[PDB]
Amino acid sequence: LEGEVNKIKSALLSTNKAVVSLSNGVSVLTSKVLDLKNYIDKQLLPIV
C-alpha cells in the first residue's frame, strides 16, 4: 500500500508535467493565432 499509492503519487506527478507541457503548447499556438489575426488586420487588409 505504501507502494500502490507511491506509484500513484509519482503517476500524478507525471500527469502534472503533461498538463504543463500541453499548456506551453497551447500558449505558443495562441501567439500564432494572434499573429495571423494581426497579419490580416495590419498587413493584408490595407492592401486589399
Partner: protein
Amino acid sequence: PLVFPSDEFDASISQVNEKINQSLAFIRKSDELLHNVNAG
C-alpha cells in the same frame, strides 16, 4: 472598409491566456501538495 473584428478578437485571446495561467496555478497547487505527502 472591411474591418477586422479586432477588439473582440484580442478580448478572446486574452481570455485564452488567462485560462492557461489558471490551469498552471492549479497544477502548481497540486504539485505543492504532492511534495507534501512524504519524500522522493
